[PDB]
């Protein structure tokens, strides 16, 4: 079942910032590799000397690429004199975030109703406040609270083409309209060592109910039309697990993947896959020969054998559950260290339900099966 | 004249080296942008648990892009024990470095006869060590000395496609054969606050002859061939200079801007310029029709019209002297901060010699004057 048990009013997911050491050339690296189009700036050129923020833009989907500048440009401000366009934003914790993490994700952002309310209920229930609510313009209500590691839940809310106050459009020669497909943040995962507190602490704030050998436990936390999905993992050891090898790489917990809805996944990937070598992403290892083979009798009212050995073109790999099929491929690590990674999903079946066709569990056995 | 003073044998550029804070990304937007080849590795793949270098070749030309891992995965090493392929490396101070001056070159290389007695020689004649003379699994000697700033001159030799001992060759799927014509570096500009002592101290332990408003006043050094060029600007203000501009966005003194020659300006800058906004690098601001109109006075004999025109159509600059004809251009700024640039260029008149044409002082009142 499906309780319904949100604390406050959840609309979408909004957007995912990334802190980076240098935001310029990991946005230019992610446009090009994702399709993603350069549609916002706050920076040096648009009076911002705190930070430099990069906005990417798929569908609905929204990358932010954030790094702080010299602290000596903004020395002679204080908080209510700040140029930063992200009230939150702290050069200390960022540069600190990115020594010990590396490129990574700061922040899922979610649109609520009152970020205000969203905060102060959250932080009623138990949740870590990060960032307290922040009015911007009078127009946009921006709060944070810890998630998991130095991860935060951003809440965004509007009065109601626009990013936030003090981003300015990029409407130009200067945001070529790349577009391979993509859509929609469908899922963001985070890894943990503990899942249990994990899961209390963030089900305990939200209300999210749970959706809920591999070598980890998961479990999907979601909201009361399962549009927002956040699922987390913990490591199981001894009898390593991979789990534990990103809390290693990444100095502990945080952001494990970003899971991205497509209109047409086999465009997505042929696009993707032309600039793998060229600067964009690399994709894992593909499934033997004998995978191919048995998506043959399994998904076969889903797929021709058109559709399919299509996929056996691409790597993609295939999973079903009573609700429908799904449509999933992951890339190699998107930076230096093992650690963050994207999944590229469409679902067959089920607007649609939310989670349709599970998220690839049966992938698993049935990848090791082919070898 | 050229005296030809040079303390010790220097053969021809080496490679420069970029620290960052993610290198996988920003040789990736490297790469697609310059049109370079990604050629070496040594990371956690090829068994170094201190840091992730990739190596970009174009020619002769090679980018060296670096970051510091988590200190946790060598915690038990010692420099005896060290699995760093670069035995000057430090996480600390590229750390610093990166947070200080951000996305910037830490080496100027120079290969050398003999880099043990080129470090000794210049050590002997003042310079500050940085990195003392290394020997590589037999065949290859490294040593550092403070040249500017926080940036190193790297002297490297060989015993004699290998770049260095622990880097893995990526001869591949994965090194896809990208080239927009660029073949080796010309120059090498640094920005101090102070010309004098930057030159008499880096003239005093190589033994480079001086080659020696605008709002600056500059110098360059050279080795006995006039092969290995090391410009210095300083700034001059109150009647701001852009050369204080960058100091106070980079934290001091640093490179300003590589100089990169190309076999064919015009179709490395079709090349890059079709990558600008899906990727690469953007290009300043073009000169005005009547900067194209004075040329036809000026270049004639070297340029027909029909190769100037497209000197406008790619917003290339164009200078002369009696040696010979310079084809210029530059990009913005190559990371987040206003510091960093490239040029692209291409020689005419004048082995070619070293230096032919100028570095474009002529340009400058020549743009000027088209407005
Ligand atoms: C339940 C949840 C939402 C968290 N979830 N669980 C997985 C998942 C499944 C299996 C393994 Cl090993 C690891 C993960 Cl993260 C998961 C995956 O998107 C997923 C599915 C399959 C595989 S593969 C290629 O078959 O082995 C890898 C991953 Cl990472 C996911 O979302
Ligand atoms: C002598 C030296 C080797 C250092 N050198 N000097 C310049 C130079 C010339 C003029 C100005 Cl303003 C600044 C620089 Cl850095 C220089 C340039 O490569 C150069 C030439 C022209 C212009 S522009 C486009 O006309 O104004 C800008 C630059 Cl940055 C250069 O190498
Ligand atoms: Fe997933
Ligand atoms: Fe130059």
């Known amino acids: 079942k499906n309780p319904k048990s949100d604390k406050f009013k959840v609309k979408r997911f909004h957007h995912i910032e990334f802190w980076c050491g240098d935001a310029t050339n990991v946005a230019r690296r992610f446009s090009w590799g994702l399709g993603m189009r350069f549609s916002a700036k706050s920076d040096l050129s648009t009076g911002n000397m705190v930070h430099a923020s990069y ?47 590396g490129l990574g994700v700061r922040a899922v952002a ?8 969203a905060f102060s209920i959250s932080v009623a229930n138990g949740a870590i406040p990060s960032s307290p609510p922040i009015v911007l313009n009078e127009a946009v209500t921006i709060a944070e609270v810890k998630l998991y590691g130095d991860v935060v839940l951003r809440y965004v809310s509007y009065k109601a083409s626009e990013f936030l106050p003090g981003f300015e459009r990029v409407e130009d020669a200067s945001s070529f309209p790349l577009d391979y497909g993509i859509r929609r943040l469908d899922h963001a995962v985070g890894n943990v060592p503990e899942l249990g507190p994990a899961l209390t602490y963030v089900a305990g704030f939200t209300g999210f109910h749970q959706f809920a050998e591999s070598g980890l436990n998961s479990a999907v936390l979601a909201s009361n039309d399962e549009m927002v999905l956040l699922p987390i993992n913990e490591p199981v050891h001894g009898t390593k697990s991979q789990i534990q090898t990103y809390l290693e790489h990444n100095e502990g917990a945080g952001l494990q993947h970003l899971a991205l809805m497509s209109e047409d996944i ?9 600039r793998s070598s060229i600067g964009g992403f690399d994709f894992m290892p593909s499934p033997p020969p004998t995978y191919y083979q048995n998506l043959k009798k399994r998904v076969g009212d889903v797929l021709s054998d058109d559709q399919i050995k299509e996929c056996e073109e691409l790597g993609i790999l295939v999973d079903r559950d009573d609700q429908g099929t799904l449509l999933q491929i992951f890339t190699k690590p998107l930076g230096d260290r093992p650690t963050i990674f994207i999944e590229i999903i469409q679902r067959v079946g089920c607007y649609q339900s939310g989670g349709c066709g599970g998220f690839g569990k049966g992938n698993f056995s049935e990848l090791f099966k082919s070898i």
Chains 1, 2 share one sequence.
Not at 71 to 98: N, Q
Not at 266 to 274: A, G, I, P, Q, V
Request: glycine share 4%; proline share 6%.
């Open 266 to 274: 086999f465009r997505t990937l042929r696009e993707m896959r032309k």
């Open 55 to 101: 906005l990417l833009t798929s569908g609905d989907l929204r990358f932010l690429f954030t790094a702080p500048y010299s602290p000596s440009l903004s020395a002679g401000e204080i908080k209510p004199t700040t140029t930063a366009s992200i009230p939150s934003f702290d050069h200390g914790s960022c540069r600190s975030f990115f020594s010990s993490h």
């Open 110 to 117: 979610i649109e609520v109703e009152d970020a205000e309310s």
